[PDB]
Amino acid sequence: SNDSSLDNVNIGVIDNIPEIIDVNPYKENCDKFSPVQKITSTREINTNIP
Amino acid sequence: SDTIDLADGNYVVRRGDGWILSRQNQILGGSVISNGSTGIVGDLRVNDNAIPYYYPTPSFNEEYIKNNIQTVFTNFTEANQIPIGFEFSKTAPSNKNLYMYLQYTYIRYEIIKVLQHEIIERAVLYVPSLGYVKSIEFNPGEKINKDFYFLTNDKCILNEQFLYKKILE
Numbered sequence: 165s166n167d168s169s170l171d172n173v174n175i176g177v178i179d180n181i182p183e184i185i186d187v188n189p190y191k192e193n194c195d196k197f198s199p200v201q202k203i204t205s206t207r208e209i210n211t212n213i214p
Numbered sequence: 215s216d217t218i219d220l221a222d223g224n225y226v227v228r229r230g231d232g233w234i235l236s237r238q239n240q241i242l243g244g245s246v247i248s249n250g251s252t253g254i255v256g257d258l259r260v261n262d263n264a265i266p267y268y269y270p271t272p273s274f275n276e277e278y279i280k281n282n283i284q285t286v287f288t289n290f291t292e293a294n295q296i297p298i299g300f301e302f303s304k305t306a307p308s309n310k311n312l313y314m315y316l317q318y319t320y321i322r323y324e325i326i327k328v329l330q331h332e333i334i335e336r337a338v339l340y341v342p343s344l345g346y347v348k349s350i351e352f353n354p355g356e357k358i359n360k361d362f363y364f365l366t367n368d369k370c371i372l373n374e375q376f377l378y379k380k381i382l383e
């Protein structure tokens with residue numbers, strides 16, 4: 165569990181990899197984006213001691 | 215080579231196509247065909263076999279060479295991602311055996327430094343262009359010349375070129 169995780173990332177070799185030009189797309193690569201809604205509930209509690 | 219008729223400074227030079235390296239002749243492999251058959255040996259210049267070989271100098275590192283060559287001559291970084299094929303076909307005579315071996319050809323680029331009209335520094339880049347095969351018909355146990363197999367120094371199978379451009383500061 166050492167404080168070192170990106171040691172195996174070699175910037176030089178990565179920078180030498182050419183960009184992806186001829187893309188062979190996969191047709192159904194995404195889902196319908198479903199937004200998440202949230203109703204915030206409020207409690208009302210009484211007290212005599214502050 | 216020494217004392218060119220050029221002004222002082224740095225130059226990018228194209229030496230032409232058809233350069234084969236020393237001791238690298240038969241490292242690709244060979245084919246033995248016989249008795250009227252036809253052998254076809256070829257390759258596809260893509261990815262790792264298209265990576266150029268660099269030979270830098272203290273003044274001319276890898277980036278200097280690559281950028282200057284690509285600014286003046288053909289951009290080999292873009293062009294080596296597109297696969298390009300080549301092939302050679304040879305037919306064996308009847309009742310005889312023929313051997314054929316393949317070796318890549320290279321574009322030879324140079325970065326030279328001229329000081330008082332005499333070359334004092336030269337760095338060399340080999341860019342893998344295409345291939346070249348050599349063939350010979352052989353008898354069982356026949357001796358073969360040492361020149362057919364082995365190459366001592368880097369040489370150009372075609373006429374050498376010298377296309378120079380002065381690198382501007």
Ligand SMILES: [Mg+2]
Pocket residue numbers: 287288289
């Ligand atoms: Mg170009």
